[PDB]
């Protein structure tokens, strides 16, 4: 996350961190329930074996409150393509259930039609992660959050050198130096509505990070609500 600010304890409790063989974070996820994490398909190519850490507030020290869970099943969208990053979605089923507690709680999945008419028409959402704090920079040891304006589809297509499909949306700023970045993929974009946070996006791709005239691109969760539901029935 470029710009933004550190999550306070309890403020981003749905964040998960995908950790590689050397226990280093490389992507985020969103806690959906005790057994399921939402993430980006493209993250699956970035470590050959990985686990999920919940409750972390500082990656370079064990503070208490962290827990690591092994993955039982990865469920990847079969239409994911690196040509365009379309269908950038996966779900992880954990081997052992998460114990909800301070700093560890699920984000809500919204109802699909209401999400499109009410959530997506809010001014802003919140993106979070442990990823790079500047383009080509270093990952954050602290969990960061950032408020990102929704950007209309026409403006985003005008801004973008690459196709924006119906499975994507755009959020962030034209020139203000705030955006998600590498290492944030898979993590939550949530929209607050009447004091409840709903999953609306997955950090997916972008041209640089916080680049002038470019936005952050997110998997549109509303397009995959039925898919997500089915992913918990394999």
């Amino acid at each position: 996350i470029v710009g933004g600010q550190e999550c306070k304890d309890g403020e981003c409790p749905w964040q998960a961190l995908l950790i590689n063989e050397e226990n280093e974070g490389f992507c985020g996820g969103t806690i959906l329930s005790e057994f399921y994490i939402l993430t980006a398909a493209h993250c699956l190519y970035q470590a050959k074996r990985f686990k999920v850490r919940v409750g972390d507030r500082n990656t370079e020290q064990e503070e208490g409150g962290e827990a690591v869970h092994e993955v039982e099943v990865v469920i990847k969208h079969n239409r994911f393509t690196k040509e365009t990053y379309d269908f950038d979605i996966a779900v992880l089923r954990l081997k052992t259930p998460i114990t909800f507690r301070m700093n560890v709680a699920p984000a809500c999945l919204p109802e699909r039609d209401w999400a499109e008419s009410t959530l997506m028409t809010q001014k802003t959402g919140i993106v979070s992660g442990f990823g790079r704090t500047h383009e080509k920079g270093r990952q954050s040891t602290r969990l960061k959050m950032l408020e990102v304006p929704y950007v209309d589809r026409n403006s985003c297509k005008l801004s973008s050198s690459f196709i924006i499909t119906q499975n994507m949306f755009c959020a962030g700023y034209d020139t203000k130096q705030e955006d998600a970045c590498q290492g944030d993929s898979g993590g939550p974009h949530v929209t607050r509505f009447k004091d409840t946070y709903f999953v609306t996006g997955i950090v997916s791709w972008g041209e640089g990070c916080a680049r002038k005239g470019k936005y952050g691109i997110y998997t549109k969760v509303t397009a995959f609500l039925k898919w997500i539901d089915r992913s918990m029935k394999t």
């Binding site: 079969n78 239409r79 039925k226 898919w227």
Partner: peptide, 4 residues
Amino acid sequence: DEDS
């Protein structure tokens, strides 16, 4: 399907 188209959503598999």
